[PDB]
Amino acid sequence: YPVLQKILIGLILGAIVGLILGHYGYAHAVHTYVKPFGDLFVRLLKMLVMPIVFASLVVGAASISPARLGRVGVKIVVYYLLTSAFAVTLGIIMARLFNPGAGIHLAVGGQQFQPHQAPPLVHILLDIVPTNPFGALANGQVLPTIFFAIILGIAITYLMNSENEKVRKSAETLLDAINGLAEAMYKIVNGVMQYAPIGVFALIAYVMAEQGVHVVGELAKVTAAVYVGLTLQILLVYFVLLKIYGIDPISFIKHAKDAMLTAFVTRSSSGTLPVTMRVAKEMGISEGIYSFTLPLGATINMDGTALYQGVCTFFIANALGSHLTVGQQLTIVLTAVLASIGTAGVPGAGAIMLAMVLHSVGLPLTDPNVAAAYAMILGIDAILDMGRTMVNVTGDLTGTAIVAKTE
Amino acid sequence: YPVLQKILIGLILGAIVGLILGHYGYAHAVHTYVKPFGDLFVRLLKMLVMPIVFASLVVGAASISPARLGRVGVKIVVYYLLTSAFAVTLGIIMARLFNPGAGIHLAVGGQQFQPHQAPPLVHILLDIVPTNPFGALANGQVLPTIFFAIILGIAITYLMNSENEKVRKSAETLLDAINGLAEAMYKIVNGVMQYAPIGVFALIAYVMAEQGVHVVGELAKVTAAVYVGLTLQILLVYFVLLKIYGIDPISFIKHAKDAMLTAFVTRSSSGTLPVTMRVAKEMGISEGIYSFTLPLGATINMDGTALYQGVCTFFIANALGSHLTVGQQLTIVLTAVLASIGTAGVPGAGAIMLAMVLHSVGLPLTDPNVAAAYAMILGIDAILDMGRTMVNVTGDLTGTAIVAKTE
Amino acid sequence: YPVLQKILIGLILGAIVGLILGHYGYAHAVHTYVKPFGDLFVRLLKMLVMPIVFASLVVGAASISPARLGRVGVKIVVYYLLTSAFAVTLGIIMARLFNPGAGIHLAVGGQQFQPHQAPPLVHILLDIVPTNPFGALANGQVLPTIFFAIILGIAITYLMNSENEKVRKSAETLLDAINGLAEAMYKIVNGVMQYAPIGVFALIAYVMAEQGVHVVGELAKVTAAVYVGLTLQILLVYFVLLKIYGIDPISFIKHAKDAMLTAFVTRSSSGTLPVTMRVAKEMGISEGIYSFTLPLGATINMDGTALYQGVCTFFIANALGSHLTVGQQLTIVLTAVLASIGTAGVPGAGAIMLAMVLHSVGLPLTDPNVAAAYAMILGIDAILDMGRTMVNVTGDLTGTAIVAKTE
Ligand SMILES: N[C@H](C(=O)O)[C@H](OCc1ccccc1)C(=O)O
Numbered sequence A, B, C: 001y002p003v004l005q006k007i008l009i010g011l012i013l014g015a016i017v018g019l020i021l022g023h024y025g026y027a028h029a030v031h032t033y034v035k036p037f038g039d040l041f042v043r044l045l046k047m048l049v050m051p052i053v054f055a056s057l058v059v060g061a062a063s064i065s066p067a068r069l070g071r072v073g074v075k076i077v078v079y080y081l082l083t084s085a086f087a088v089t090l091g092i093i094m095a096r097l098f099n100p101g102a103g104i105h106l107a108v109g110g111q112q113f114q115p116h117q118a119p120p121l122v123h124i125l126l127d128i129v130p131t132n133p134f135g136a137l138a139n140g141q142v143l144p145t146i147f148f149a150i151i152l153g154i155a156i157t158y159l160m161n162s163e164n165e166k167v168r169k170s171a172e173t174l175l176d177a178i179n180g181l182a183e184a185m186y187k188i189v190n191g192v193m194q195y196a197p198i199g200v201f202a203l204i205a206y207v208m209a210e211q212g213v214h215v216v217g218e219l220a221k222v223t224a225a226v227y228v229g230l231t232l233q234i235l236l237v238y239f240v241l242l243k244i245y246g247i248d249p250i251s252f253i254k255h256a257k258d259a260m261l262t263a264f265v266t267r268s269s270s271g272t273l274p275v276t277m278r279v280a281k282e283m284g285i286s287e288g289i290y291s292f293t294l295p296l297g298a299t300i301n302m303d304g305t306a307l308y309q310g311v312c313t314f315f316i317a318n319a320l321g322s323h324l325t326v327g328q329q330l331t332i333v334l335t336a337v338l339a340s341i342g343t344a345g346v347p348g349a350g351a352i353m354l355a356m357v358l359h360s361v362g363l364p365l366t367d368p369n370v371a372a373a374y375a376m377i378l379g380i381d382a383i384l385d386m387g388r389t390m391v392n393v394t395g396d397l398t399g400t401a402i403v404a405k406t407e
């Protein structure tokens, strides 16, 4: 079987056969038939995310405790914050280049219930230190898991340096077992990726059926302004920073191919952690960097979302007719990067970041005009999700590759 | 101590001392006193179910991946479906041989709230793939655990055949650790089984006290119609299929003794998984079969239940006086087997399988007449439960032994 | 760094800097600035409790199954019950010595909703057997964890004495891995303790700011009675039971220093289990004993709390001016120890014990006279909490040290 080129065969063939069933009216025929097979690929990928993160990090933290992780962390965080600053500013620039929401229309009535406010920042940061590390594992919670795997990984290094060889014996057993699990999930990530072409096919067969035949109108200018923005993010920020650190862009892209396409159809950043990690091991990076930077990046580094929040804020302010302060769009840029940090763990964050970025400008989702305009964006949001998720994993790999060269 | 005949001693003694306290009115004195000792034995048994299943299946998947597990799995499923088909039809045949519900009385008022409808089949089948496999373990969920153990066990076998002997070194360590846990619970099961005769005593001391002195009247005909059906299930379908597959029935029965009797007093098919599994290993069956077919069978193969649903539907339709379609009791048979698959994981399925098999014939529990008659069955439901749970586990062992001979 | 004296340098400075901020109004400034650092420390400790308890007890159940554990447990329980009986009677004796509640004022009408009643005893005991051992781990549940670790450890020992060396091979592998984790958590308890000085400083900085400057008046007589009582507990019961058992009290206090001081600033018996456990290991005691008698003591042996319940009953009855039965304060003492067994696992028990000790005397929290007095105590409750939690862990160490010398 061709494989990995079979995904692309299923991608193009699906996107057309869904789009054809979309304009013909069979959107909810696809939902009750084709979709479950596309979900199956997502479920199987998600299955691996917890073991592969915990395992490959305890193993990963056999690596110079402070000088690595500490400086790796500091660099990857400084990378993440600056790329997200670019992402939003390019989204603003693209929404001034285009004009999404030219028509001051939009009928008013039937709208948002306003997402719950982000928890106090102190109670977000204090929460990266888990209280029951079995608990964190037992339900999602990547951030407390990252903390625990590093603190266990550093301890088990300090254990294998013990002058007692019952201590250095038992510590070696545990680490190997945990490494067993690590390697096991990477073997299943090859299995789950064999089903990908059936899953990929069935995923865009639904997105193009339910939201594709709705991409026309003023919303076409949104989808274009976002996607051109996302393309320019890839070329202007990723390729340039990749070149300026001496790692070949196309050799990077050839390796990233698997992780990119699963992120594009899964529309889950943390969901495609197993594929983005395997693609980083397959890329030659050590587990001391990638086992840490990738899951952290699937939680803080949202470049595609930060760009989408650029153009979405403008859209709504254009749908109402707000002047957007001839000078103070630097507030939309500031609280878009501050959103990612102050939302960190808190689940369903994509809706609550945009909520506080829209409130930052002065367009709360509570005023029925702002909300009716946001409602029209949500008619084509799965289309925009694909492109923005795909950039959310690119930044992860790109930052991981830069930290790999520096450290 | 005599032991394993100590169970039979406590059973006969307990059932008499329960039944004697039953007709003397001290049913709630047994609830508040004898009962907890019966609960302890169930608690301790349940305790081992999660580790023993997960452990002995990762270990269990050290066995030719496709040709075994696949064909094992296909056979056992084809077995399960056809045994469930016989069971319901034998229940129909036993309900036409007897006449449960001769009196068209039953006073109306005070009945069911109608159980929750079974989740859409695609969100039951997709649910067999877990998302957080640690979470699967964290709270019950035998089905997604089975899927993960097997997917881990296939991964850990492919890992051991690697040309790198750091990867095989770490694979072996993990497998053996997991196998430590496997053997651990099996050694515990021997202990918990030493408490069995006290637990056994205290359980039928309750069931006969609370529902025993209630088994008189038209309900005696039901209990006789179900139990003669359960006896004939073992004799006509198990002892025939066992013999026709070249394994001695009595040699099988002698080995099944422990598993049979705890299932009869626990009334939990998954609850007596460690005893049915220990009895399978002690039977000499390999972990490549029994470690997969037994926890699957405590979730799909409910022959005793499917048989009970035959006579229960007939009881309600005779209480009302419905004709039961002179020909179309095939619809009762059909939806009984399709209840087992379409319920799978979903908790409290015993009521929801019967809710839809009754709805299939045309007797909804929403109708105050149907539900008034169904309320009378529940007054002797734990009497019926013992017999049906005991046949639920037999077929799991019977199927396991048939697959062992075949594969 | 000086260390373990840098804790003391922070405690004194923090107690004065909180107290100074308190009588100057800036209590709620300290809550929103200093307090988080104090929390970080407590979160970090609580993080270890669940692995450290489970691990160092499967490993700790490498030791003569019955003769040890059985007799160990039966000693430590009889120990626990007698020390808790002393504590409450030293509470009554210190409350008759002082007179907390001279003034029969207290204005009425702003009071307690009455804490949920303690679950029936049989469902407390039956609940010490967990039903899903992974469950118990995944969420708190120190008692059922204890029961699983001990039943695992007994089984893994019997497993290691098998004439087959595939079973003995795997059991040894499992045990080392579990011990890998055991060791690892201790290595971490050294790191988490390096943060203690800052954590300690920020913790009394709070309690002295929010409840310090409220310690004046008739509540001063309370605080004094309790603390004098708790001091007289340590001198008269621990140092006397230590001496009489042949373990130098001051050498014991040199060793207990770390666990004593964190229990005082954390106010969490079970939260400082890691510091109490490493200080038992570093004391030279065996995992056979300490690994079982320490968590079981952070769940039954609240000496300092049962002392408080003595003087609190008196204060409330003094506030109302009840005679406290010229004789029947024995019923306070009796139900005070029963409270500890009869509350076991059941969370929030602290209040739910005081509830029933007060109801025992005959002053339910529901009488808005009793309740208006009880809410006055709660004003200086964190101040009393420190002193009593530190006496709650001392008894756990003291018992373990007595049982070590005996067994
Ligand atoms: N679907 C996107 C992704 O997974 O990258 C993402 O939605 C999910 C999400 C993931 C992480 C944090 C917040 C929200 C987004 O659109 O921002």
Ligand SMILES: N[C@H](C(=O)O)[C@H](OCc1ccccc1)C(=O)O
Pocket: B267, B268, B269, B270, B298, B299, B302, B304, B305, B348, B349, B350, B351, B353, B385, B388, B389, B392, B393
């Ligand atoms: N007690 C029986 C068993 O566990 O086999 C069974 O109850 C539980 C159950 C198990 C599986 C599916 C439905 C219901 C029944 O009463 O039919």
Ligand SMILES: N[C@H](C(=O)O)[C@H](OCc1ccccc1)C(=O)O
Pocket: C267, C268, C269, C270, C302, C305, C346, C347, C348, C349, C350, C351, C385, C388, C389, C392
């Ligand atoms: N601080 C005490 C302790 O942890 O020992 C304790 O407070 C916490 C607690 C512990 C156990 C049950 C309920 C509440 C008490 O005052 O009884």
